[PDB]
Every structure is written in C-alpha cells, then in structure tokens.
C-alpha cells in the first residue's frame, strides 16, 4: 500500500514469505524471502489439574522473547 | 514490544476483518500532543489470528514444528489449592492477562506499540475480577497516552483485550499474551507464487478476512462471536 | 525447547555413537496413544557432543568466539555456607540438573521435545540425592508421556540424564542444562566442501562417531566411560 | 536420509554449514549456508559450569523456551 | 585492518552494513549485508513519578525490540 | 556478553575518539598469566556511542523503528517512597549500574568480554554511593582478572564506567547497561556505497571520531565533557 | 531469433502504443492449422522502441556504455561507386532490410518468432525498390505461415516493416535489423523500486506508451508520424 | 498479466530489471534482477560517404549475435 | 564422482539445474542453480522444396535462440 | 568447441547408455605422447541425447521456448536443382556433416574437445559419399591426434559420427552438427529436488540410460537401433 | 579508484573475481563474484595462433562485435 | 568492441607496466572536438597480458579449460602454395593483423573503443609489408579520430600494434586479434580474499606490473623486450 511506497525509498520493505508448505515460520529464520515480518495478537488462558494450544495454535514452537 | 516500519498486523493491515471499522470505541483519552486517542476492544484482531493459524483441531497456518518464532510475551501460572484455601503467596483463585496494540499515527517515523501485562487474583467472585479488568484497561489506556512523550510519538488508536479463567480445587492455571513475528506461507495467498514476493503481500493486504476465507475454502471460526478468551 | 523438521541430534542422527542401539531401557511407560515408550540413559548422546565440541584443553569444534548460539537452557547457583550451616533460603548442600530428549515418532508432523529442569538440594548425604534423581526420571518420564496429548503427538524413545555436585564450605556451585543450536563447519566433515552443502550433511549422517574420529585423527574422549557429569 | 527426501518436498531442508575454520556457529547467524540446525545435549556441574567437559565457552547465549 | 586479514582466511569477516536510510539495525536481521556486527557501550539512568526514560536518555536506542543475550 | 571475532567497538576500533590513547589508567591488576592489566574509565567510549546514535532531540544514527536489536543488558527499577521512608524491600534511595569491556589480547583466539552489573542502594548521602561505586570497580576489575583462567584467556585493557541517580519522594528510578549489536548504515560512512561493503568498513575504521563528525557536518556532543551519566 | 516464455515486446506487451489495436491488416494468409493470420505494418512497435531508447540527441533509456546486449541481427553494406557506374559485385544502388515479429497464439507452449532479412539492390529508380519490398512482405508472410508446421505452432499476428536508402556517388550505405534483449532500468518505471521487481514489471505492463511519456515528462517523438525508417 | 500467472507455476518469470541509473543492459549480464528479458524492434538505414546511431540509439554497445 | 571431489577444491563445481518444469535451458541463463553445464551430441540432416527441418528432426532443439561458440 | 572442467556429456558421464563400454573401436592412432587413441562410432551418445530431449512428437526434456542455448555448431544448405543438373557452385547432389568428441585423459588439466565439420557433395551415387565419409573419419581422427601437441594434451578416446542425405529434384537440404550446453530440469532427476543441487547431479551420474527410462516411465527410442542419422 | 566512486553511485561496479583456483574465466559465466569485467590485448600470428605468446588456449570463444 | 563503465584494461588500469607513461607518441591527430589525440605503440599492454595469462609452457593465469570467454576478435588464414606460386585468390605470401584501443576521455559517459582489423598480403618482400603496416596505423588512427562524432565522444589516447608473419612453401598461416573479457582469480591478487571483492580489485589497481610479479614470485617475460608479435 501507499505506505510501502514511501517506505521503500528508505530501503525498507515489508515482504515476509516463508518457503514452507502450509507452515508459518519466524522473523529471521534463514530462507525467508523478504525483510519484513507479520505479527498478530494472542491472549488465551486455561487451567488443568495448555495456554498455547488453545484457540489460536502456536504449538510446538521454540519461543524467543523480545521485550 | 513494538511493530515498526517492517510491520503489518494480521487483521488490521493484512487480512482485515470487517468488524474493525464497524467498531466504535469504549472511550477516548487526551494525549500530550492533544489528540483524543480512541481505544477499542481487541476482539476482531484476536479473532483474526485464530482464523489464520487455526485451532489444534482445525489446523490452518501454524508455526512450523520446531521453528524459532521470536515473540513478545509474558506468562503466569499458580494453583488455587487442593482444599487448603490458605495462600502460600504464589497461588490465587484466578489468573488474567492482556495485550494492547496502539497503531502509530505515522509509520515513517514512530513505531506501533504492544503493551502486554498479566497477573493473578486473590478474591473468588467473578464480578470482582471482571470489574478489575475493565478498570485496568483505562490504566493501560492512560498509560499508552503519556507513553508517547519520551519518544515524542503520538498514536492513532489502541486496541486492548483480555483472557482470564477462574480456578478452584488444586487446579493450576495459566494465562498468556503473545505477539508472534512470522512470515506468511505461499498457499495462504490465493494466486501467490514464490516468484512474486511483493505482489504476494499486496494480495493479503487487499483481501478482507471474509474474502480470504472464501477463496481458500475455509469455514469461518470467528463467525458469530463463538470464540471465548 | 524443541527440535523439529529442521533437526538432527549430534549423536543420534548425525555422528552416531555405537552405544545407542547397544543400549537397553531403564523401563517403559504407557502413552495416551497406547505405545510403550522406552526411556534410556542419555550417556551416549552427551558423550557425543563432547567428542565434537571438545574440552577446554582438547579444543575441537566449538562455538566461535563471540557468536550468538541460541540455546534452550536453565541454570542454577547457590552456596553451602562458610560454616554457618544455617540456610538463608537460596543456599543448599548440593545442586542438580537434567535434560531429556524424546524423539518424535513421525518428524513430518510432530516435533521432538527437550525437557530440561534443575534445582538445589537441602540434605547432605549423597545417597539421598542420587536417589531423588533416579526417582525424578520417572516423573519426567510420565511427564513426557501425558505431554503429547495436547499436541496429539506420540514419541518413540526418551533419553534422560543428570549432572550434580555436592558442595560443602562456602563454595558456590552451578548446574546447567543446555541444548545448543549450531551449524557444522567444513573441516569437521571429511571430504566435505563448501560447494557440496547437502552432500556434506549426508557424510556426517553416515559416519558413526568412531569412524568420524578415525578419519579426523582425533583420539576418543568418551572411550572407556571416562567422562563424569 | 529418507526423511529429508519426504521433508524437502515441503520446502524444508536440514543443511547447516558454517563458513568458519574450525568453529561452529549458531542457527540464524548470517552467512550460514543452509536452513536447518544441528543440536546436542549438554549437562554439566561444578562447585565454571559451561567450560567443563563439553566447551560452549565464550558464547553469547540466547534463550529459547 | 591487519586483523581482518588474518581473520578472513578463517572465513570470518566483520562487515556490518544495513540497507536503510539513516537507521542502524541489528545483528541477524534479514537484508543486512555482511556477517559481522558493530557494538558500543551505553549506561544511563533517569526518573518517573508514582501511581523508556532510561533508554531515551543520552544515547537513544529508543523504540527498539530488545532481545537479551547473556 | 561478548564481542568476538566478528567485533568492532564504536569508539575503540571504529570511529575512535582521541581521548582513548590520551587516557591513562586508574590502576593495574595482575592476571593469572602475569600481565598487569590496565583499567581505564570508560568515558570516551560511552561518549562515542552518543555521537553516533544521537540524542532524542539530536537524532543521528539510531536503531530503526521496530527493529530487533539483540543486546546484552540488565536493568533495575525501584521507588524511594511517597514519604513513608520505610522500605518495602524492592525500594531504595538510589539506583546504579555499570558496564565493563575488556579487549582481548588476541582476537584470533579469545573473545573480548563485557561485564555489566547493577543494583539499588539503601543509604541517602551521595558520597556513600559514589564511594561504593569507585570501590566496586576494583571488584569488577579483579573479577575481569581471575575471569580469564577458565578460558585461559588474558586481556589487554578493561574500560569500566557508571550511571546512578539518587532519588527521593515517591519517584521511581531506573538504571541500565546495554551493549547493542548493530550494523552500520551507508550514509554514516562518508563516501561509502552499498557496492563497497568492506571498503565501507575500513573508512569507519580509519576516521577518528572528530574527523567523522567534520565530514558529516555534525556538531560534537561529547566535546567539552558535557554528557552526564 | 525468438522471443519465448520469458518475453515481452516493448510496444505490444509493455508500454503499448495505442496504434496497435487501432491498426488494421494489410492482408491475411491461411496457415497449415487453418487460421487466417493477419499481417500488419510494424510502424507502431518500431516507433515505440525509439521513444524508450531515445535518439542520439534526445537520449532516454539506452544500453549502457560497454554492455553486452545480445541481439538478433543482420546487417549489410556496399558502395554505389565514385562514378564508375560499373558493378564490382558487392556494390549496389540501394540497400534494404526488414524484421518481422509474429506473436505466438499460446505463449505457454510455442515461441514468438522474429524473422529478419536484408540485401542490396541493383536498379536505381526508387519505385522499383519500393515495389520489391511491398512484394517481399508476402514472401516473408507466407513464409511465417508454412514456418509453423515443423514446430506444429500457429501464430496469431505478424507485424512486418522496412528500412532502405537509395544511394548514388561513392557513398557507402548500411541497412540493419536488430531485436535487442534488454532488462529495464528503475527510473523508467514510474513508482517502481528496486525492492518491487515484479510489481515494477506490471506497472510497465499497464501503462500505454502515451501514459508512460506523460508521467515521465518526456515529449513524444513518434507523435505525428515524424520518424522515417 | 494473466499469462505470467500461468507461466510462474512452471518456474518461469519475466521480470527484467537492471540496477543502473538510466541505462538499459542486456539479458544475462550479471547483477540483473529477474530472469526474463524485454525485446523490441529496430530497423534503420543510413549512408555516408551510422546505421545503429540513427533513430533508436543502441550506440556504443558490444553486440552478441544469437540466431 | 571422484573427479568432482578433486575438482571442487579448485573451486569448480559441475552442477547444472534449471528451475523450469520439464524444460532444459542454457548455460549462463539467469536463475540456473549451479556453475557447470551439461552437453550432448546432435547431428541430423533433412529436406525442403523450392521457391528448422534439420533441427526439428530426431533430437529436438526446436524453437531455440542459438548462440555460437567456436 | 570444448567441454572442460565444468563438463558432463549426456550419455558418457551422466545417463550412460550400456552400449558405450559394450563398444569396440573402428581403429587406433598413435598420438605425439605415444598412446594409441581408440576411435569409436558415436552411435550411443547421439542416441542418448535423443532419449533425453525427445522428438517433436515424443516431447521429453527439450530447451525451453525462447531460451538462449549457446551451442557449438556449423550448418550447411544447398539445392540439387529443378532439373537443370548444371551446378551454380553452391549446389550439390548431397549434403553431409559430422561431430567428434574426444574425452580428455585428465579433466583436471586438459579439456575434452569437440570437432565438428561439414559440407556438400558433387557426385550422385550414394556409395561414393559413404565412402568419402568413412575415409574422412581418419582425417578427423589423425587430426584429433596431432591436435593435442599445441596444448600438450593427450586424449583417451574419440567418438565420431555422421549425418547425410542425398538429394535430387530442386529440393534444398540441410545438414548440421550441434553440441548444446544446457542445465538439467528437476523432474528429469528421479527423486531430485531443487534443494539438493549436487545430490541431484550424482543421481543422473549414477543411473544408466536404461534405468533412467524405467524410473521415468519413458519408453525407449534408441532401443533396437531405430534412429537414422 | 576515484572513477569507481563516481561510477558506483550510478549502480555500476567493476569488480570481476572468479572462484577458481588459478584459472581466469569469462564475463557472465555463472558464479563470478562482481558485475564488471577485465579485458586485455592480444595479437599474435604463426605460419597455433592462440597458443602463442599469451595463452587463451582451449577456450570456447563467443564473438561480440 | 568496446570496454565501458565496467572496464579495466590489464596493463593500463590494473597491473600497470611502467612503460606506459615512459612511452611517447608516434604522432598526434586532430579530433572533431579539436584535441590532439596522441597515438602510442601498443607494446606495453600486449606484453602485460602475456605476463598475466602466461605462455603454454610458463602457465600462469589462463582461461579455464572449457570456459566461455566472450571476446572481440577477427582471424585470418591462407596458404602460400606448395610451389605453384600462382594465386587461387584466398592465398597470399604473408598474413597480418592489428588491434587498437582508445581510452575514453570521460568513462562516465563515453566508452573506450577497440578497433581491430586484419588481412593477407600479396607481395613477398618483408619491407613492403612492414611499410604497409606502419602506414595503416594512420588510417586506423584518423579513423579513431572521425570515429567519435556519431557518438559525440572524444578520446584521450589510442594505443595500436601488429602481428604478421611472412610465409613461403605451402605453409598455412594465421593471424589474430583478440580482446578477451575475463574475471580475475583470487590468487593473482596478493592478499586478496574471496570475502573482499572490491578491496581485491583495488590491490590489482594499485600494483605496477613489476610489483605484482615480485610479490607473486613470477619471473618477468616482457623484461628486456624478448616477446616477438
């Protein structure tokens, strides 16, 4: 969109394509085509007597914290 | 956290759920610049991300088995005990967490911010919690507001939401927030191709979440408000 | 954490130490799917990694000075005091830690899991610790077992191990677990070449740890059980 | 191995070669040829943890959980 | 410098160029030309008042997504 | 953290401020190898990084809005209360932090180390703090010294510095250390070009901080000692 | 030659001059498949390429000084002598050349063909030459037609044109045909960017030659038929 | 255009961008972004007592014949 | 084969993979993965009648832009 | 042309037809080094290339529509007239051409050579032509032989072959030689993958032409000597 | 040299490095690092042209005019 | 052809032989612009290329076995017969060829030109040939001069040279010109490295041909005028 156009002249693109079938993968992992990222919002809660796996799955992932 | 010049939020910027302009604030707050920053419930966005990643059963475009998804997150866990309803301090009756995204007025200069926070709760009537939460929003909200001045950066709208669960019995309960940072796969982009990287992006940037679902042949899941948080 | 589709474990998948099929379980545990998941001592694997990275003295293929090796780890430190054998809570007589790897049954879909945990110990007879540890395994073990169901993922074998050291006197002691994620260098691959990236891999995938050592002219170090943990 | 063959058609490879003499380096550091990683297991303790037995010494650790 | 020359034969370079106008960016972010990094030292301290300000003072690393390495 | 083979420190290795060889130690400390390792105040280096990134107002070459600058850091925050000058333990009168960089004698083998630490302070006379700090240096210093032996690595000079602020009234105060890891932009390199990657580096490696400023048309900010810490 | 799957013809496929659908055949010819293949004068296309490369004076987007432009070409040179109007065989009164492009019906399978030919002429009345040429077209034309059968490939329209010059006096004269194979530069694409490679293409594929000129601020040169050939 | 879409699934793209200011350059020269080419038609004649330099300039070029 | 191994240490590889479905393409065309080439032998002869047919016979190198190397 | 260090000949080095070691020379020739260089008919190799590229009807792995296949070639065309069996010099009764490949003894240093030549023939009894050709071989052969000395390069075997066609009536006839230089496509390599570039090569280097056909499900075409030349 | 500096801002570099041990190779052959070329002058004759004096022997020539 | 913006001439621009500024013209020629363009013998340059590629025996940095060196060239061959000293037109007593390089005044805009030409000679006294050649230079020279005007490009110096050989007896003789276009190898650049592409270039651009030889440990071959042409 228009923003990209004003953004690109700075050298910044926001493409973020992964080369895997079906799977998303993360910012910076090698082989990703593009130099941007795509984000989203997830907040979910669960008890058992299981947060991650509910509603939106980010399951089986190696998380890296950025703050 | 932040989402900057390289960013696009699933739901707002790409794959838009209709809901978003259909929405209407909970309220507004003065910023140091002076603009009334509208705050809206984050239901649409959250819901979007579900449609895209999918659920454990309805698996759609989820992070690859074994990948390194850098994320902004905080988590929290505690028990509400076997019966011993006596509190060894890291225990509570309920657990809660929240995330807040405030889109930057000008993405050429300032960065959009995520603010996510969480905790545990020591009462056991749901109303008291519910109440604390709806209050909390305004804290986060005014917080988003004075937040800009260091950066001399003013926002344009903050979207905020929550997840809680009330426990009892010796269950342990967890609550989290997570902003992930992913790169999209080819087949999530109808008529995308590994040779058309930026066009591939503008296709996702031009479909509304509905449209996307239809071309992909995926039944909705946000649909008629059916996702709890 | 995990090791997924992009994974290979030094020792099991590449550079195999003979020991691994020579091994025999400590026991088995039912999973929710129903298969008896064998659990084995992680001695071979651990030992492998030593042969490859080398020791401070016998330096072999270690992470580059200044690199950013993302790792899965946990650590722990405490003292066991000057004499004052009175415990200001973050102190203990001994420190311990463990790691556990459970290879996924089907790498096309589910991810192999690492489970690593650690702590401190408040008794001072070695037997009591030793004992706690061998017990602990089964906890971790049954834990690996019910662990799958969220993911609906069943394993095929978990390999588990420990390191502890018993302190006394006002020494401070540290115990850690670390799974590193590295990329191999050319000269660790006999007849590898920077132009043959995937063939380079299949050479490491086809040599047994012995064989590798011989072609490289490196004396063993696991050899006759000589590494303590 | 056979797995790679079924894996590659998904777009996933597991090559992980570093361009340095002797040194290993980490997943994602620029200049690595390949898109996979190689892992291992290390647990050691001492009454100085890191530098014992298997050396991952002098490293900038990044936690992933 | 001379070091680079002895370093390069090992395969290590220390180039770290970013493709953005004006902005610096971080080690490992995609699109960076080179395989090295450039570091610096920043220690600063500041204030807020009851019911960011370290970072934004003196040397700005403001509005950044920090990733800890230890 | 460390800075290794891929490293260059803004101020010492590239963009050198004159001050650095003009400097003179605070003292020296024997290492296990035996060389007297000089320790110097880290004023020049710190100041350098300011000139380069710039200040919130005087914005020069700062990290891009939304980027992922991996850093070595520690932080600390506490209040010194509304009046209630009674201490609920995570509160203090003053907050302090420090960083220390020790350039490796031989970059082909050993890695340069950063050591950064921080805390809070429970007295309220500035002199007492000041004093603690100048003491602390020697701790860190001797610490840098015996630090090498595990690695069998000896340094060549450690540069150490501090930032503190004394609070009162119910203010909250924060103190941090941060080593960032960045890649330089083209226009910070006079006569650099995106096609000349390594020559671009040697230009920054050959200009002194003064020179750089002049060619760029940037007024100094370190200049006549005008930056507080 | 040919122009295949990787092709786009300046004028027909990208940068279209209006003239092209405004055109109307000179005639048609049966092909072995059976479709009447229309043949049109190649004025528009030729003219297009001028607008884009520019003229020695009105320099626009020409091949770089020293580049290696692979081309399909044929050339011819001869004198028409000092007076000695006696013909040492490689001499002639006039020289002529032509090019012909026939767009393939289906670019997924067959390739578009260029046919270019040339020679010299031994009469000295212009009409006789003119005449030979307009005749020649039909030869080339029927030639394009039976041409397909080897390939079992049928075309969709052939565009054909000429350049000649009549000499006298001991002048030497040259005539050529050339199809060049170039890659477009960024600034010829309004709002193109080196980061948007395929979008950059679709911009040229969607502007008509007019439009392109206007956005670029380039005065026409084909305009009112002002280019001789 | 539509064709590219049916073409791309074969692995063929038709991008042909040059990294030079103003100048076009040729198919296969290193540094070109894309894997396609762009062609055109030029026929011109001139005597003197000079083909190339007339009308459409492909002047000062190293020609490589393909037939 | 063994030769490649002795060849690679000089910096020469002989990989020549094309990224097209079904089609072969030529040495040096952009997008080819590898830095080698694959060659073959073709000699064929044929006919036309007064007023392509070599090429298209037996082994097809049809519809190709030939570039001569001598 | 030559085929050097980057070379592999379809048929000899990759995709081998059995025939090749089954073969037996026509004769031998001394070289300046002194080794008897065997010369063999080039039937197997020629035939191989057909199996791979395929025929106009049986289309297999042919050069892409519009590609730039650099080749070593020579061609020849002439008529044998309407009746006027009087020879305007570029005419003849028959046309012929040949190619010859001589694999270098040591590919690390010397390059394998192609020698291809052609012409027209002025008699009209087939035997006379046939005869000229079988003679010609020895010319080319001894030619391959003294050919090395400039380069101080000795061969190991030359493979030579021919194509001719005898004309009559006002037909025009063409004869060519062509060595193409291509890069192989993924699906010609059973179990090849775009991610395994060098392994992809070793698969073609290890299958015999038979084997290749079977895995691909392609019927032979060389089979029982059925290709004319 | 100075020229390169004024040249680079146009996008043109003149680097031409080959990845082979000892051997030179030609403009445009895949794997060459850089986007320029290096040329030279050779004229030789003999009564066997190529192989004399300056060797460009055993080469596949491609004419450019 | 030409040598343009991407160009560097072995001998003039990189690897300079001293001889070049030591030189002095044969003469000058007015150009249409008006500057006197000096013309010099091309001995130094020619000789340079020898030192770099090496000779069949003294093999130095020659084109790889089997490579595709695009070149600007022309060649010529003929016999001077068995005795029959009667001339079937493509025969001659001697053969000759020449090359000429004229460095452009401004490489930002105009391209440097090569002009190479050749032929055969029908007399048999060497003096007559020699003479024709030294004459010829001026033709080529004035030709270089009016050559610019189409391009409106003026040169700065043309360097021109020759090779001839006089035959007799039924020998066949060949004469050629060739400008090659190569890319340099790493080890021809002292202290060059595959990681320092542009620095690698400036090293060759800063050594004189002498210097280069010394660091490489290569004995000269131009040395004391010992190369015939």
UniProtKB/Swiss-Prot annotation, chains B, C, F, G, J, L:
Pyruvic acid (Ser) modifications at: 1
The protein's name: Histidine decarboxylase alpha chain
Signal peptide (from-to): none
Active site: 116 (proton donor)
């Amino acid at each position: 969109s228009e923003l990209d156009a004003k953004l690109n002249k700075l050298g910044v693109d926001r493409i973020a394509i992964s080369p895997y079938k079906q799977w998303t993968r993360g910012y910076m992992e090698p082989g990703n085509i593009g130099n941007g990222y795509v984000t989203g919002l997830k907040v979910d809660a669960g008890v058992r007597d299981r947060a991650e796996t509910k509603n939106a799955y980010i399951g089986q992932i190696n998380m890296t914290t950025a703050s | 956290x932040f989402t900057g010049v390289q960013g696009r939020v699933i739901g707002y910027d790409i794959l838009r759920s209709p809901e978003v302009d259909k929405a209407k604030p909970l309220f507004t707050e003065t910023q140091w610049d002076g603009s009334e920053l509208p705050i809206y419930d984050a239901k649409p966005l959250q819901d979007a991300l579900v449609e895209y990643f999918g659920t454990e059963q309805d698996r759609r475009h989820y992070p690859a088995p074994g990948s390194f998804i850098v994320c902004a997150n905080k988590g929290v866990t505690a028990e509400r005990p076997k019966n011993d309803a006596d509190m060894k301090p890291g225990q509570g009756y309920g657990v809660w967490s929240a995330i807040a995204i405030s889109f930057a007025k000008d993405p050429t200069k300032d960065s959009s911010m995520f603010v996510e926070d969480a905790g545990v709760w020591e009462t056991p009537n749901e109303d008291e919690l519910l109440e604390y939460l709806e209050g909390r929003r305004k804290a986060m909200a005014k917080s988003i507001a004075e937040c800009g001045q260091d950066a001399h950066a003013s926002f344009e709208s903050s979207w905020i939401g929550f997840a809680y669960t009330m426990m009892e019995p010796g269950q342990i309960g967890n609550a989290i927030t997570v902003a992930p940072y992913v790169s999209l796969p080819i087949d999530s982009i109808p008529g995308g191709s590994i040779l058309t990287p930026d066009k591939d992006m503008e296709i996702m940037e031009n479909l509304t979440m509905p449209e996307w679902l239809e071309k992909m042949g995926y039944k909705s899941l946000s649909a008629n408000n059916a996702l709890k948080y």
